[PDB]
Amino acid sequence: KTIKIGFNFEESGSLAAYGTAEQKGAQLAVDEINAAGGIDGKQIEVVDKDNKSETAEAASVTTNLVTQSKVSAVVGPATSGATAAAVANATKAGVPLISPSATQDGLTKGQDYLFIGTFQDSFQGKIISNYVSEKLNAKKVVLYTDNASDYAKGIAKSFRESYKGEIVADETFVAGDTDFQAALTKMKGKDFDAIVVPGYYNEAGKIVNQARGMGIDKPIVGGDGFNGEEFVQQATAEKASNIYFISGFSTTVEVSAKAKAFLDAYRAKYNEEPSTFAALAYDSVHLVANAAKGAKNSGEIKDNLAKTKDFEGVTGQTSFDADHNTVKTAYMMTMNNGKVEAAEVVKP
Numbered sequence: 001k002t003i004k005i006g007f008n009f010e011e012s013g014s015l016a017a018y019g020t021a022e023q024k025g026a027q028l029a030v031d032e033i034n035a036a037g038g039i040d041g042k043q044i045e046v047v048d049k050d051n052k053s054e055t056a057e058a059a060s061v062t063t064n065l066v067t068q069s070k071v072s073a074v075v076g077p078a079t080s081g082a083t084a085a086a087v088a089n090a091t092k093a094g095v096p097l098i099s100p101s102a103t104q105d106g107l108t109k110g111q112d113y114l115f116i117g118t119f120q121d122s123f124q125g126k127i128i129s130n131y132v133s134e135k136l137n138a139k140k141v142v143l144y145t146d147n148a149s150d151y152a153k154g155i156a157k158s159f160r161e162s163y164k165g166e167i168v169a170d171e172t173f174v175a176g177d178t179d180f181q182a183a184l185t186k187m188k189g190k191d192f193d194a195i196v197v198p199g200y201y202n203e204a205g206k207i208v209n210q211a212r213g214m215g216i217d218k219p220i221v222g223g224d225g226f227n228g229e230e231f232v233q234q235a236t237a238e239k240a241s242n243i244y245f246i247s248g249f250s251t252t253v254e255v256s257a258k259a260k261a262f263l264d265a266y267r268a269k270y271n272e273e274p275s276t277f278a279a280l281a282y283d284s285v286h287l288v289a290n291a292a293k294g295a296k297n298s299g300e301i302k303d304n305l306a307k308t309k310d311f312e313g314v315t316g317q318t319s320f321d322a323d324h325n326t327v328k329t330a331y332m333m334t335m336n337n338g339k340v341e342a343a344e345v346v347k348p
């Protein structure tokens, strides 16, 4: 027999770069585990569903995975809105759901069936404030945020709380926008030392593109939403200079053997570079597979995940606390000409 595992990922739509990276990293882990004999001698059977980057679809897909497909665990969604919309449906069926990358604070509170593989937005905002203040030496900044996003708003809230310099402009945009001219024009005529942009790649990359196009050269700093090659494609490699952003995976600073092995394996399998989201998803599959060893049913997989205190993976350790959260190493990436040239370990 087999062990059924569902994927619920943003494989198409506005968040596709994130979910597709996770699909690739998760599938690589499954393939390897299967080649090595499966779990308890059972092959992993994947039911891979695309949530289209939509919250209602993420919810519907979860119901179908847990009640029709009758999967034992779900990996994904990648993003916070979708994860928040999926959790109650997994919970009703008593199936654990692990999001490799949903950073919304408090998402796991009281959620016996939700696990989060990454850090939180409060942590991101604090790191951004510390970095722009102490490393970019910024006494004045522009804050430009996706107002249609709880993710972006959470990072912005934390940033404002921590930052002691002057926010000279606190402007907005919304997901789906493709024109940022008015706001950028308004910013240009003001002295500032950096622009902090909480948001996702479709908007952030276009913002970088347009800012640099109109002569704004100062540092543009983002949260984890800046990861991936689609951000660089939107910005264009030329304009993707003086860019800094948070990541949970680095190929150069304090690089572990597991990170090296994953980079090599992903390149061999896909002939592409992995993002931090592929790395987190690869670890999430291993966390579930390990938890499935000796598990008689889905509640036991959940219990076993909750007892995971010392897992070592591609993204360092995973050690779940009582709230199903794990501390994770974070890096501030330095990007020029669309390439990461430096990585610095950072913490609040």
Ligand SMILES: CC[C@H](C)[C@H](N)C(=O)O
Pocket (backbone or CB within 6 Å): 018, 078, 079, 080, 081, 101, 102, 103, 104, 151, 224, 225, 226, 277
């Ligand atoms: C892919 C994850 C994204 C960038 C974000 N951390 C979220 O929670 O929505």
Ligand SMILES: [Cl-]
Pocket (backbone or CB within 6 Å): 178, 205, 206, 207, 209, 210
């Ligand atoms: Cl553009």
Ligand SMILES: [Cl-]
Pocket (backbone or CB within 6 Å): 215, 216, 217, 218
């Ligand atoms: Cl400038």
Ligand SMILES: [Mg+2]
Pocket (backbone or CB within 6 Å): 048
């Ligand atoms: Mg398929």
Ligand SMILES: [Mg+2]
Pocket (backbone or CB within 6 Å): 191, 192
């Ligand atoms: Mg000045």
Ligand SMILES: [Mg+2]
Pocket (backbone or CB within 6 Å): 264, 265, 268
């Ligand atoms: Mg090899």
